[PDB]
Design a binder for this molecule. Structure first.
Ligand SMILES: NC(=[NH2+])NCCC[C@H](N)C(=O)O
Ligand SMILES: [Mg+2]
Ligand SMILES: [Mg+2]
Ligand SMILES: [Mg+2]
Ligand SMILES: [Mg+2]
Ligand SMILES: [Mg+2]
Ligand SMILES: [Mg+2]
Ligand SMILES: [Mg+2]
Ligand SMILES: [Mg+2]
Ligand SMILES: [Mg+2]
Ligand SMILES: [Mg+2]
Ligand SMILES: [Mg+2]
Ligand SMILES: [Mg+2]
Ligand SMILES: [Mg+2]
Ligand SMILES: [Mg+2]
Ligand SMILES: [Mg+2]
Ligand SMILES: [Mg+2]
Ligand SMILES: [Mg+2]
Ligand SMILES: [Mg+2]
Ligand SMILES: [Mg+2]
Ligand SMILES: [Mg+2]
Ligand SMILES: [Mg+2]
Ligand SMILES: [Mg+2]
Ligand SMILES: [Mg+2]
Ligand SMILES: [Mg+2]
Ligand SMILES: [Mg+2]
Ligand SMILES: [Mg+2]
Ligand SMILES: [Mg+2]
Ligand SMILES: [Mg+2]
Ligand SMILES: [Mg+2]
Ligand SMILES: [Mg+2]
Ligand SMILES: [Mg+2]
Ligand SMILES: [Mg+2]
Ligand SMILES: [Mg+2]
Ligand SMILES: [Mg+2]
Ligand SMILES: [Mg+2]
Ligand SMILES: [Mg+2]
Ligand SMILES: [Mg+2]
Ligand SMILES: [Mg+2]
Ligand SMILES: [Mg+2]
Ligand SMILES: [Mg+2]
Ligand SMILES: [Mg+2]
Ligand SMILES: [Mg+2]
Ligand SMILES: [Mg+2]
Ligand SMILES: [Mg+2]
Ligand SMILES: [Mg+2]
Ligand SMILES: [Mg+2]
Ligand SMILES: [Mg+2]
Ligand SMILES: [Mg+2]
Ligand SMILES: [Mg+2]
Ligand SMILES: [Mg+2]
Ligand SMILES: [Mg+2]
Ligand SMILES: [Mg+2]
Ligand SMILES: [Mg+2]
Ligand SMILES: [Mg+2]
Ligand SMILES: [Mg+2]
Ligand SMILES: [Mg+2]
Ligand SMILES: [Mg+2]
Ligand SMILES: [Mg+2]
Ligand SMILES: [Mg+2]
Ligand SMILES: [Mg+2]
Ligand SMILES: [Mg+2]
Ligand SMILES: [Mg+2]
Ligand SMILES: [Mg+2]
Ligand SMILES: [Mg+2]
Ligand SMILES: [Mg+2]
Ligand SMILES: [Mg+2]
Ligand SMILES: [Mg+2]
Ligand SMILES: [Mg+2]
Ligand SMILES: [Mg+2]
Ligand SMILES: [Mg+2]
Ligand SMILES: [Mg+2]
Ligand SMILES: [Mg+2]
Ligand SMILES: [Mg+2]
Ligand SMILES: [Mg+2]
Ligand SMILES: [Mg+2]
Ligand SMILES: [Mg+2]
Ligand SMILES: [Mg+2]
Ligand SMILES: [Mg+2]
Ligand SMILES: [Mg+2]
Ligand SMILES: [Mg+2]
Ligand SMILES: [Mg+2]
Ligand SMILES: [Mg+2]
Ligand SMILES: [Mg+2]
Ligand SMILES: [Mg+2]
Ligand SMILES: [Mg+2]
Ligand SMILES: [Mg+2]
Ligand SMILES: [Mg+2]
Ligand SMILES: [Mg+2]
Ligand SMILES: [Mg+2]
Ligand SMILES: [Mg+2]
Ligand SMILES: [Mg+2]
Ligand SMILES: [Mg+2]
Ligand SMILES: [Mg+2]
Ligand SMILES: [Mg+2]
Ligand SMILES: [Mg+2]
Ligand SMILES: [Mg+2]
Ligand SMILES: [Mg+2]
Ligand SMILES: [Mg+2]
Ligand SMILES: [Mg+2]
Ligand SMILES: [Mg+2]
Ligand SMILES: [Mg+2]
Ligand SMILES: [Mg+2]
Ligand SMILES: [Mg+2]
Ligand SMILES: [Mg+2]
Ligand SMILES: [Mg+2]
Ligand SMILES: [Mg+2]
Ligand SMILES: [Mg+2]
Ligand SMILES: [Mg+2]
Ligand SMILES: [Mg+2]
Ligand SMILES: [Mg+2]
Ligand SMILES: [Mg+2]
Ligand SMILES: [Mg+2]
Ligand SMILES: [Mg+2]
Ligand SMILES: [Mg+2]
Ligand SMILES: [Mg+2]
Ligand SMILES: [Mg+2]
Ligand SMILES: [Mg+2]
Ligand SMILES: [Mg+2]
Ligand SMILES: [Mg+2]
Ligand SMILES: [Mg+2]
Ligand SMILES: [Mg+2]
Ligand SMILES: [Mg+2]
Ligand SMILES: [Mg+2]
Ligand SMILES: [Mg+2]
Ligand SMILES: [Mg+2]
Ligand SMILES: [Mg+2]
Ligand SMILES: [Mg+2]
Ligand SMILES: [Mg+2]
Ligand SMILES: [Mg+2]
Ligand SMILES: [Mg+2]
Ligand SMILES: [Mg+2]
Ligand SMILES: [Mg+2]
Ligand SMILES: [Mg+2]
Ligand SMILES: [Mg+2]
Ligand SMILES: [Mg+2]
Ligand SMILES: [Mg+2]
Ligand SMILES: [Mg+2]
Ligand SMILES: [Mg+2]
Ligand SMILES: [Mg+2]
Ligand SMILES: [Mg+2]
Ligand SMILES: [Mg+2]
Ligand SMILES: [Mg+2]
Ligand SMILES: [Mg+2]
Ligand SMILES: [Mg+2]
Ligand SMILES: [Mg+2]
Ligand SMILES: [Mg+2]
Ligand SMILES: [Mg+2]
Ligand SMILES: [Mg+2]
Ligand SMILES: [Mg+2]
Ligand SMILES: [Mg+2]
Ligand SMILES: [Mg+2]
Ligand SMILES: [Mg+2]
Ligand SMILES: [Mg+2]
Ligand SMILES: [Mg+2]
Ligand SMILES: [Mg+2]
Ligand SMILES: [Mg+2]
Ligand SMILES: [Mg+2]
Ligand SMILES: [Mg+2]
Ligand SMILES: [Mg+2]
Ligand SMILES: [Mg+2]
Ligand SMILES: [Mg+2]
Ligand SMILES: [Mg+2]
Ligand SMILES: [Mg+2]
Ligand SMILES: [Mg+2]
Ligand SMILES: [Mg+2]
Ligand SMILES: [Mg+2]
Ligand SMILES: [Mg+2]
Ligand SMILES: [Mg+2]
Ligand SMILES: [Mg+2]
Ligand SMILES: [Mg+2]
Ligand SMILES: [Mg+2]
Ligand SMILES: [Mg+2]
Ligand SMILES: [Mg+2]
Ligand SMILES: [Mg+2]
Ligand SMILES: [Mg+2]
Ligand SMILES: [Mg+2]
Ligand SMILES: [Mg+2]
Ligand SMILES: [Mg+2]
Ligand SMILES: [Mg+2]
Ligand SMILES: [Mg+2]
Ligand SMILES: [Mg+2]
Ligand SMILES: [Mg+2]
Ligand SMILES: [Mg+2]
Ligand SMILES: [Mg+2]
Ligand SMILES: [Mg+2]
Ligand SMILES: [Mg+2]
Ligand SMILES: [Mg+2]
Ligand SMILES: [Mg+2]
Ligand SMILES: [Mg+2]
Ligand SMILES: [Mg+2]
Ligand SMILES: [Mg+2]
Ligand SMILES: [Mg+2]
Ligand SMILES: [Mg+2]
Ligand SMILES: [Mg+2]
Ligand SMILES: [Mg+2]
Ligand SMILES: [Mg+2]
Lengths: 110, 77, 141, 59, 203
RNA sequence: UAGAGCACUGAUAGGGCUAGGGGGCCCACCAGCCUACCAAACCCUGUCAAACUCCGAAGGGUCCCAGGUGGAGCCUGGGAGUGAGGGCGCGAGCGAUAACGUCCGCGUCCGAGCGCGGGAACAACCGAGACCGCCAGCUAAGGCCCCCAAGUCUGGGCUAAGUGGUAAAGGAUGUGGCGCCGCGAAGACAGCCAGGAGGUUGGCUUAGAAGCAGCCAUCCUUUAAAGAGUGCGUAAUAGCUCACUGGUCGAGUGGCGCCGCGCCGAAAAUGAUCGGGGCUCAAGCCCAGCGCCGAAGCUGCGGGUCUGGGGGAUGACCCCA
RNA sequence: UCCUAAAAGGUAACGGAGGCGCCCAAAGGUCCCCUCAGGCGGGACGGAAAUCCGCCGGAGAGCGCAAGGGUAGAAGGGGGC
RNA sequence: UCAACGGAUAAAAGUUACCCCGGGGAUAACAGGCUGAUCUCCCCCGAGCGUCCACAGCGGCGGGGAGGUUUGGCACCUCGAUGUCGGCUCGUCGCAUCCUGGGGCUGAAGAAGGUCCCAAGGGUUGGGCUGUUCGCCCAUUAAAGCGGCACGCGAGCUGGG
RNA sequence: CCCCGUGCCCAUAGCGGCGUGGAACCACCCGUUCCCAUUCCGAACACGGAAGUGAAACGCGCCAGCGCCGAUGGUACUGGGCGGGCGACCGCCUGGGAGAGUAGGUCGGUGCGGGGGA
């Protein structure tokens, strides 16, 4: 038995996979936020960014914007440019939207 | 007496058209089917009648993925 | 007598009759059994005759198990009509019996009663039969 | 190792693929003997008609 | 009691050949071993008609060993009604599931009224240690009528044995007999013609 | 798909459990109690399915690489014929698990091989693809007592029915080979001997039912032994006999099961017949050998023709395939 | 559409069974969200079945309509433009 | 609803025993053939009848065959022709025997029957009705048999159907 | 070695039962001012937080009641080659070889990246 959480996750993620682009996978906990760029052709993660590894302040929104900036900066170093935003079960809004906006501000192409 | 039976439809000539390993070109129809008995894989598109056709030049390969179904891919050349 | 109470299709094709039995080749209820030796379509009339014969020999007492049931519909065209113009009309029902199936079993009766009853029952059948008793080979299946 | 195959029974009345098998081995007339290299393909075609033919192993 | 049987080893000999030589082929196995074997058909028949799968049969192997076994499976030739291959389970010291016979002690009152004691189970499945294999398990059926029934839950089990079926498994009953006086009412009782299941727009 | 299987769609017999009714007590004061009654769902045991499948072969199809030089394949064009098929084998459907029936699939053969050998004779069954010649040789199927070419060939067994040389259910001390049981010199079986008896002319039971007109009964006494009875018998009775024990004879006897070959069941129309004569430790039937005969197949020998390859250079003619 | 059809395709009969000659302006495009039938228990009128709550439930529901295939990791239910 | 759905024209139904030609045994009616559902006959089983008794005489429910005289199925020779019902004449054959002969069982006292077995040598009438075959009827009889031979026989006759 | 993400195998991974984990991570949790939200509901979604709890959910262990997996041997069936029956059908040779059932197995394995630990 699946839950609407997992169903929504599958539903957005398969449509992301079909486009054959690298996926900026987002995960959002109650405290922190994590984001890793994945190539599903090899089952490998290329670049990772998070507020737990960067030790960031309070406001989850500005924190996510900063982790997006960091992810885009570390990604442009490895030749990555175009990507597809894996919003997972999270509606593109608020914290996740700020992460995406920070990623675009760093030069990531999506 | 009489009969109310004798009628049928013209057969539809369905099924697989390019078995695994067969080199194909861009657009070759790979499978004809009602429903998704085979699902599209890498470099394989599907049409409005569930027809799998190659998206690039390459080589057919099948992949049975258990409960996920059966997939047909095109390895580039 | 014996016939299905409902079916998905009224008329069936004739099929084949090759091989030994698919199942029911071992005693599993009574003390004795009547086993078939050659394949045939055994009509419900014949099964009813055999049953009635066995209970008429027992007069009162014993238990009879019928392990075949006629679900194949027999068909026949009307008399003096030519070929074509459809398939015939269902005139009865038969049970596909193949070599080595126990068709009847008798329990709770003397050995002589069971032997003679199974004999008179077999005499109503359109095939050769064999009288069998329950063996440890049956008990192991 | 090579095979010595000899046609001993007539292909008349046998399915056409067995006639084609005879045509691959090079047997056309009865009592004709041929010596073919013992490869799996020639061996398969020889086994296909082994009821019409007599085989002996040589060299 | 305790039965013995002369066994032999077999490797590539075709089974049809052995059976035309009067020998019943089989296999000998447990969670530790597996060997193709064969026995004499007539001697095996003499033994098995008394032992069945209920009593232990020790196999006397040609290398000298004597392995205590249980008949686990026997295939029959459905057309000839004859044993064609035996399965021998080599016993160890741990417990094991098997079938123990049932003796129905007492003559039911239903049988005294004219009915029939239908023995639905002539044995029962039990998980027991090999050193504690009983010969049977008695059952009181003298208080049965037409038509009561006995179940596995009413089985008095000797020490060391445990039931290996659900206690809801019925084991015996007593049914009314066959009666000619019913032939008249059964012959003239009309049976309606079979109703075909509606396909398409009807249901 | 074959097979198999019951998890799905349906069928399905018995049992268990158990909504629902039927019926019976007990009530209209609304519930209760009993079901050898029909019976949903569910479980157990056991099954069935072209239009069911949790399963699932052998095969079949296609692509790749490789063998494969064949009256093979691929491209372009000229010219047709055919578009009534038929028998057989396998897989099915229709039919009646009928038709030298009918309609498909795979194959084959006749068609067009009504050319040849076998099958008595006979398009399609068996053998086998006929270029021409020979008073040569070897085989195929099939045959080797005479017609009629070649064994009255060798070794073992079965059959007595001319079975062989047309058929079924079913029936039988035909006969033979394997096994399985008992009972037997604690004297069996067969015959011949006596005994075969009491409660008891027993009961659910009725108008005769005394062992022997149906059932839901078979219990005891005297016993060496005797069923509250195998059959004949009676309107019932009576009688006779069996199972049964004792005696007499002294070594075998009776009841089952598997396999081989014969017997009956077996009546149709001009004259009979296995093709004929004729065959009985076969000239029949089974198992195993050796030899021979046997075709237009194969070989030897000569020749023609086409195709290819050498000659030679080119239709000059010869050799080889 | 299914069977016959002999596990590639195709395959006949006056063989076995059914349907079509429409419909939808959303029953179409896209983005976002949601998951059934059924069984048990509980609940005014309210019942076998109206709506409510809890637990079990991989799909037996649904997918305009015949049948088959397919299908909730949506092709089903709802909304926005 | 060119639905006869690859759709002869924009536009179309019947009758012929008054009939004709070109063809077909590629296709029916007669007969033969194959088949044997049907039909006729004979067996198997022994529920049950027969006061008593399964089998003198009978045989529920069912089972297996034989014959090729019925009606059919199929469409194989014959449509550049195999005359089709019934009769008359003339026969011949089969035997599942009507009579005559020889038997067994009998619910066979005798006389007379019933049933089955063997037997095809010979025999098996005259008339009323109706085209009839068949069948019914009259008067007899040892008996008034059933079938095959292109439903025997029109280069023998008849010609009522 | 533990935890958090994200794949692959596609139930040997599941149902059920018992036990364990909060330092970290995750979850529930405190709020509903702000963004966003309910065909009603801050349940869900969403935002700001950090008092508490591992009660739920999750992760990690153990158990074979169910579920799932499943040999070997034999058998059915069969491509090819032969016989037998008047037929329904039945055998032999050679190669292939099930399904059911038996023994038994299973309360998952593994890739990549992060946070913590030795
Ligand atoms: N290997 C085979 N394909 N065998 C098939 C057996 C068929 C054969 N006709 C028989 O009855 O036995
Ligand atoms: Mg109609
Ligand atoms: Mg219609
Ligand atoms: Mg049509
Ligand atoms: Mg068609
Ligand atoms: Mg078609
Ligand atoms: Mg079709
Ligand atoms: Mg295909
Ligand atoms: Mg499309
Ligand atoms: Mg579409
Ligand atoms: Mg692969
Ligand atoms: Mg690929
Ligand atoms: Mg058919
Ligand atoms: Mg029938
Ligand atoms: Mg029929
Ligand atoms: Mg019919
Ligand atoms: Mg007609
Ligand atoms: Mg019938
Ligand atoms: Mg019979
Ligand atoms: Mg079974
Ligand atoms: Mg041939
Ligand atoms: Mg072949
Ligand atoms: Mg081939
Ligand atoms: Mg030749
Ligand atoms: Mg040749
Ligand atoms: Mg040779
Ligand atoms: Mg035996
Ligand atoms: Mg409809
Ligand atoms: Mg099948
Ligand atoms: Mg089922
Ligand atoms: Mg089952
Ligand atoms: Mg099918
Ligand atoms: Mg499997
Ligand atoms: Mg394959
Ligand atoms: Mg095919
Ligand atoms: Mg292949
Ligand atoms: Mg091919
Ligand atoms: Mg090549
Ligand atoms: Mg060439
Ligand atoms: Mg050519
Ligand atoms: Mg051309
Ligand atoms: Mg030309
Ligand atoms: Mg033509
Ligand atoms: Mg034409
Ligand atoms: Mg034609
Ligand atoms: Mg044609
Ligand atoms: Mg044809
Ligand atoms: Mg024909
Ligand atoms: Mg043909
Ligand atoms: Mg054959
Ligand atoms: Mg056939
Ligand atoms: Mg018949
Ligand atoms: Mg035929
Ligand atoms: Mg046929
Ligand atoms: Mg024809
Ligand atoms: Mg045709
Ligand atoms: Mg011609
Ligand atoms: Mg030819
Ligand atoms: Mg001529
Ligand atoms: Mg001729
Ligand atoms: Mg000839
Ligand atoms: Mg000849
Ligand atoms: Mg000759
Ligand atoms: Mg010829
Ligand atoms: Mg010679
Ligand atoms: Mg020979
Ligand atoms: Mg001769
Ligand atoms: Mg000879
Ligand atoms: Mg001579
Ligand atoms: Mg001699
Ligand atoms: Mg005689
Ligand atoms: Mg003779
Ligand atoms: Mg004779
Ligand atoms: Mg017999
Ligand atoms: Mg005898
Ligand atoms: Mg005597
Ligand atoms: Mg009395
Ligand atoms: Mg007396
Ligand atoms: Mg005779
Ligand atoms: Mg001799
Ligand atoms: Mg010669
Ligand atoms: Mg020649
Ligand atoms: Mg020459
Ligand atoms: Mg030449
Ligand atoms: Mg098909
Ligand atoms: Mg099909
Ligand atoms: Mg197909
Ligand atoms: Mg195609
Ligand atoms: Mg809308
Ligand atoms: Mg729609
Ligand atoms: Mg609900
Ligand atoms: Mg209420
Ligand atoms: Mg309600
Ligand atoms: Mg559905
Ligand atoms: Mg929508
Ligand atoms: Mg919309
Ligand atoms: Mg706008
Ligand atoms: Mg038209
Ligand atoms: Mg028109
Ligand atoms: Mg068309
Ligand atoms: Mg027009
Ligand atoms: Mg006009
Ligand atoms: Mg008109
Ligand atoms: Mg018109
Ligand atoms: Mg006119
Ligand atoms: Mg006129
Ligand atoms: Mg007129
Ligand atoms: Mg007139
Ligand atoms: Mg006129
Ligand atoms: Mg005139
Ligand atoms: Mg006039
Ligand atoms: Mg005129
Ligand atoms: Mg004319
Ligand atoms: Mg003309
Ligand atoms: Mg004709
Ligand atoms: Mg025509
Ligand atoms: Mg005609
Ligand atoms: Mg005609
Ligand atoms: Mg005619
Ligand atoms: Mg006529
Ligand atoms: Mg005719
Ligand atoms: Mg003629
Ligand atoms: Mg006949
Ligand atoms: Mg008949
Ligand atoms: Mg007879
Ligand atoms: Mg009486
Ligand atoms: Mg009498
Ligand atoms: Mg009587
Ligand atoms: Mg009689
Ligand atoms: Mg019959
Ligand atoms: Mg008859
Ligand atoms: Mg005739
Ligand atoms: Mg005939
Ligand atoms: Mg006639
Ligand atoms: Mg006709
Ligand atoms: Mg005709
Ligand atoms: Mg004709
Ligand atoms: Mg003529
Ligand atoms: Mg004519
Ligand atoms: Mg003429
Ligand atoms: Mg003339
Ligand atoms: Mg006579
Ligand atoms: Mg007389
Ligand atoms: Mg007389
Ligand atoms: Mg007499
Ligand atoms: Mg008298
Ligand atoms: Mg007298
Ligand atoms: Mg008298
Ligand atoms: Mg007699
Ligand atoms: Mg006479
Ligand atoms: Mg006469
Ligand atoms: Mg007269
Ligand atoms: Mg007159
Ligand atoms: Mg007058
Ligand atoms: Mg007159
Ligand atoms: Mg007159
Ligand atoms: Mg008349
Ligand atoms: Mg007189
Ligand atoms: Mg007289
Ligand atoms: Mg006459
Ligand atoms: Mg006639
Ligand atoms: Mg005439
Ligand atoms: Mg006449
Ligand atoms: Mg004439
Ligand atoms: Mg005449
Ligand atoms: Mg004349
Ligand atoms: Mg005339
Ligand atoms: Mg004339
Ligand atoms: Mg006249
Ligand atoms: Mg006239
Ligand atoms: Mg007139
Ligand atoms: Mg008239
Ligand atoms: Mg994880
Ligand atoms: Mg805890
Ligand atoms: Mg904490
Ligand atoms: Mg704490
Ligand atoms: Mg707080
Ligand atoms: Mg507010
Ligand atoms: Mg604020
Ligand atoms: Mg909240
Ligand atoms: Mg939340
Ligand atoms: Mg917890
Ligand atoms: Mg969660
Ligand atoms: Mg936990
Ligand atoms: Mg374990
Ligand atoms: Mg599996
Ligand atoms: Mg298995
Ligand atoms: Mg195996
Ligand atoms: Mg074959
Ligand atoms: Mg076989
Ligand atoms: Mg084999
Ligand atoms: Mg093998
Ligand atoms: Mg298996
Ligand atoms: Mg598990
Ligand atoms: Mg668990
Ligand atoms: Mg990987
Ligand atoms: Mg690490």
């Amino acid at each position: 038995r699946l839950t609407a959480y997992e169903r929504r996750k599958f539903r957005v993620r398969n449509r992301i996979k079909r486009t054959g682009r690298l996926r900026l996978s987002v995960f959002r906990s109650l405290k922190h936020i994590y984001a890793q760029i994945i190539d599903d052709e090899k089952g490998v993660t290329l670049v990772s960014a998070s507020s737990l590894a960067l030790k960031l302040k309070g406001n989850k929104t500005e924190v996510a914007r900063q982790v997006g900036r960091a992810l885009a900066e570390k990604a442009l170093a490895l030749g990555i440019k175009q990507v597809a935003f894996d919003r997972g079960p999270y509606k593109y809004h608020g914290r996740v939207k700020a992460l995406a906006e920070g990623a675009r501000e760093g030069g990531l192409e999506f | 007496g009489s009969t109310k039976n004798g009628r049928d439809s013209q057969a539809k000539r369905l099924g697989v058209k390019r078995y695994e390993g067969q080199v194909v070109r861009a657009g070759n129809i790979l499978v004809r089917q009602r429903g998704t008995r085979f699902k599209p894989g890498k470099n394989v598109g599907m049409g409005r009648d569930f027809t799998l056709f190659a998206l690039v030049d390459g080589v057919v390969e099948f992949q049975d993925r258990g409960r996920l179904g059966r997939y047909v891919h095109v390895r580039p050349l | 007598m014996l016939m299905p109470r409902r079916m998905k299709y009224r008329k069936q094709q004739r099929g084949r009759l090759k091989g030994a039995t698919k199942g029911g080749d071992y005693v599993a209820f009574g003390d004795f059994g009547l086993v078939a030796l050659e394949p045939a379509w055994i009509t419900a009339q014949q099964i009813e005759a055999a049953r009635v014969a066995m209970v008429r020999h027992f007069r009162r007492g014993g238990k009879i198990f019928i392990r075949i049931f006629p679900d194949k519909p027999y068909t026949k065209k009307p008399l003096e009509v030519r070929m074509g113009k459809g398939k015939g009309n269902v005139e009865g029902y038969v049970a596909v019996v193949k070599p080595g199936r126990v068709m009847f079993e008798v329990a709770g009766v003397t050995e002589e009663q069971a032997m003679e009853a199974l004999r008179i029952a077999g005499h109503k059948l359109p095939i050769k039969t064999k009288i069998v008793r329950r063996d440890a080979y049956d008990e192991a299946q | 190792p090579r095979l010595k195959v000899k046609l001993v029974k007539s292909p008349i009345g046998y399915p056409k693929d067995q006639k084609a098998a005879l045509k691959a081995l090079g047997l056309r007339r009865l009592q004709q003997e041929r010596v073919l290299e013992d490869t799996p393909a020639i061996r398969g075609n020889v086994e296909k008609v082994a009821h019409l033919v007599r085989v002996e192993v040589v060299e | 009691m305790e039965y013995r049987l002369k066994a032999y080893y077999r490797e590539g000999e075709k089974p049809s050949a052995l059976r035309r030589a009067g020998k019943l082929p089989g296999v000998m196995y447990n969670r530790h071993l597996n060997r193709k074997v064969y026995v004499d058909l007539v001697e095996f028949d003499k033994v098995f008609r008394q032992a069945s799968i209920h009593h232990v049969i020790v196999l006397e192997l040609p290398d000298g060993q004597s392995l205590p076994t249980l008949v686990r499976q026997v295939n029959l030739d459905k057309r000839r009604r004859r044993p064609e291959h035996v399965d021998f389970f080599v016993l160890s010291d741990e417990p094991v599931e098997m079938y123990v016979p049932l003796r129905f002690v007492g003559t039911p009152a239903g049988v005294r009224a004219g009915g029939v004691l239908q023995e639905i189970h002539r044995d029962i499945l039990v998980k027991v240690s090999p050193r504690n294999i009983p010969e049977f398990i008695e059952v009181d059926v003298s208080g049965l009528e037409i038509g009561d029934s006995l179940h596995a839950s009413d089985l008095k089990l000797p020490p060391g044995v445990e039931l290996a079926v659900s206690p809801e498994e019925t084991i015996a009953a007593v049914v009314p007999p066959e009666d000619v006086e019913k032939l008249a009412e059964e012959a003239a009782a009309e049976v309606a013609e079979p109703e075909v299941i509606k396909k398409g727009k009807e249901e």
